[PDB]
mmCIF file of C-alpha atoms in Angstrom:
data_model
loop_
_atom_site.group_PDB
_atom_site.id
_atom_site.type_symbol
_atom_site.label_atom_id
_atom_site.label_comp_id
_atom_site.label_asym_id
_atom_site.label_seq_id
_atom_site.Cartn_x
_atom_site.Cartn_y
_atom_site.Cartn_z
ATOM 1 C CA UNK A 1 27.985 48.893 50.039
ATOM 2 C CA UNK A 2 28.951 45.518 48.417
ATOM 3 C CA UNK A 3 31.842 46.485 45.229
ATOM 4 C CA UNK A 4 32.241 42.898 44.306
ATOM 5 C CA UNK A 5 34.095 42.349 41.332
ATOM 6 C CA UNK A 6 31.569 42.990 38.882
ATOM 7 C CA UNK A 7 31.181 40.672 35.668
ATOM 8 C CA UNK A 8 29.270 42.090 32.477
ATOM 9 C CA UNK A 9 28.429 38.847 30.195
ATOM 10 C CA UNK A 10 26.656 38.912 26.695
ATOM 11 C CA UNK A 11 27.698 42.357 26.594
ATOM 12 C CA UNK A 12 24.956 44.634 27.875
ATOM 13 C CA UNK A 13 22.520 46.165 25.142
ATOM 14 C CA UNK A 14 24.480 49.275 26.234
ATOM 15 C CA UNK A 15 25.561 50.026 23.013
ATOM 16 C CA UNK A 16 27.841 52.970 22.571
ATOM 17 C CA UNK A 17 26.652 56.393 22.567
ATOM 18 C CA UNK A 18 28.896 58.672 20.374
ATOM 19 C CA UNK A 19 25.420 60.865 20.106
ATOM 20 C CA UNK A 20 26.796 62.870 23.591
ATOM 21 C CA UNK A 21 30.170 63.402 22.165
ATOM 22 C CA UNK A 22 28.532 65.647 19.728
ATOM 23 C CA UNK A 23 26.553 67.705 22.475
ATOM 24 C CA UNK A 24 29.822 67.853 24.679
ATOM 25 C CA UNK A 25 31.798 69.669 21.610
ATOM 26 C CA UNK A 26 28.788 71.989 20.766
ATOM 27 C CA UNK A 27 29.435 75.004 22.705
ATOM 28 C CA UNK A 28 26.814 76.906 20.945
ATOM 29 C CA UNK A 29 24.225 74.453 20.887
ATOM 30 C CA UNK A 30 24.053 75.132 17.262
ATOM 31 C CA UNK A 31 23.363 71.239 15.991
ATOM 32 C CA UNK A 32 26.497 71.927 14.104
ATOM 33 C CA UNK A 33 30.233 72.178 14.198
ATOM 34 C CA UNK A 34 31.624 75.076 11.783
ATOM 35 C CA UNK A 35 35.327 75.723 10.909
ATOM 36 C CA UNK A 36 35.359 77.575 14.374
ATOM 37 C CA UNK A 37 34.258 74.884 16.273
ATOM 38 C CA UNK A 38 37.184 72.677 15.150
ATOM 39 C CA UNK A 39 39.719 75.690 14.640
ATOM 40 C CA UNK A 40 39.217 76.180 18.648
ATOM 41 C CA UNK A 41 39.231 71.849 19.139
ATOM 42 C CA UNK A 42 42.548 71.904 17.507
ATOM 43 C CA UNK A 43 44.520 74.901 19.088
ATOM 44 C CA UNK A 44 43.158 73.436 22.690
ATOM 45 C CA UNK A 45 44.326 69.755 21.760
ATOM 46 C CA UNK A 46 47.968 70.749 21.713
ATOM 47 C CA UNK A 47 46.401 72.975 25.567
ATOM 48 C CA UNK A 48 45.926 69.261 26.672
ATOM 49 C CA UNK A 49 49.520 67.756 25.743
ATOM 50 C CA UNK A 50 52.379 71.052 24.416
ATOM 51 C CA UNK A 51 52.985 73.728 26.858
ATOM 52 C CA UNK A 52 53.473 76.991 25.149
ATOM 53 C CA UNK A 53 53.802 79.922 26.619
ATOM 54 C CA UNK A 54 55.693 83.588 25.209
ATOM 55 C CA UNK A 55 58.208 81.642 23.015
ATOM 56 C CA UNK A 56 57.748 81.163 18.859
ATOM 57 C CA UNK A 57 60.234 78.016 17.394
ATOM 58 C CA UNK A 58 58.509 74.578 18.879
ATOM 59 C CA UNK A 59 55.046 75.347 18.033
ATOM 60 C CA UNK A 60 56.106 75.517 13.936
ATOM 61 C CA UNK A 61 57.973 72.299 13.190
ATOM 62 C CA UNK A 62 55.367 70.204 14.389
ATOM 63 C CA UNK A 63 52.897 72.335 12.733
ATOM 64 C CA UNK A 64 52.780 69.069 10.817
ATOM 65 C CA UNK A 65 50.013 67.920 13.437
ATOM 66 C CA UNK A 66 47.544 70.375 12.967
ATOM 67 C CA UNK A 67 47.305 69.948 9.631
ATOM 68 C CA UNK A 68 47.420 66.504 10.026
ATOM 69 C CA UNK A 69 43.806 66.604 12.085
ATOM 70 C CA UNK A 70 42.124 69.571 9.592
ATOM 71 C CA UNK A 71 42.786 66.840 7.026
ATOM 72 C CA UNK A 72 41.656 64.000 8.137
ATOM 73 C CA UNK A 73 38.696 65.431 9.662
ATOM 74 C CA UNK A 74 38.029 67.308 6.919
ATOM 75 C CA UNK A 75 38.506 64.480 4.361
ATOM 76 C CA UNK A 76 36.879 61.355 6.411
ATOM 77 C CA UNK A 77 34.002 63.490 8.070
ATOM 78 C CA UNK A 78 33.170 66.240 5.481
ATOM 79 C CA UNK A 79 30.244 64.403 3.813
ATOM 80 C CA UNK A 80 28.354 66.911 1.670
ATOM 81 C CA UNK A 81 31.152 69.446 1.613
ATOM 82 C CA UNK A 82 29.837 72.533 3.132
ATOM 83 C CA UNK A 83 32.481 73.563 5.670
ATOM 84 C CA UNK A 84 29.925 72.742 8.127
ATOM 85 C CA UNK A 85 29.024 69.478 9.650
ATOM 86 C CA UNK A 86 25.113 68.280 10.563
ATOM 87 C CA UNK A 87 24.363 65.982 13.017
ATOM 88 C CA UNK A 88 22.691 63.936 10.218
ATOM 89 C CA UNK A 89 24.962 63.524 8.214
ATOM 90 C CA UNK A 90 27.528 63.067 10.545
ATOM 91 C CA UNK A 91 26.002 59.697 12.499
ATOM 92 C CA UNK A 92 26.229 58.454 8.695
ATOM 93 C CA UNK A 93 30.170 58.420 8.526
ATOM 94 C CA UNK A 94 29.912 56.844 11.683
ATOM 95 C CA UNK A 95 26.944 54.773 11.597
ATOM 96 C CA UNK A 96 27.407 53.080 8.308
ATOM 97 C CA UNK A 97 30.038 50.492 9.231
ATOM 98 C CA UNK A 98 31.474 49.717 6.607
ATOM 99 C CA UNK A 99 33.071 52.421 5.351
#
């Protein structure tokens, strides 16, 4: 077993691969991602970095977040407007560069 510090060069045709992000988030194995799919993405976010627990005060002030994400989301990924997102459609906000 010979680690070696390994040395990438050119940058291996590897390109990125944001096509499995998709499949990891699609619980369902719809093709899709509906307003439940996020609604579930965002409450579990704050799972991943708040704490709450049995107490109602510090999950309200920074309710400020959440919308924060069903904006953005909603406003930089939506691309035919139909509440629900196609796999299609979605590489194109992605795929087209410039944008």
């Amino acid at each position: 077993l010979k680690e070696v510090w390994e040395e990438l060069d050119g940058l291996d045709p590897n390109r990125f691969n944001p096509k499995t992000f998709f499949i990891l988030h699609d619980i369902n194995s719809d093709g899709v991602l509906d307003e439940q799919e996020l609604e579930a993405l965002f409450t579990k976010e704050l799972e991943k970095v708040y704490d709450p627990k049995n107490e109602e005060d510090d999950m309200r002030e920074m309710e400020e977040e959440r919308l924060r994400m069903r904006e953005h989301v909603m406003k930089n990924v939506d691309t035919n407007q139909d509440r629900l997102v196609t796999l299609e459609e979605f590489l194109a906000s992605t795929q087209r560069k410039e944008f």
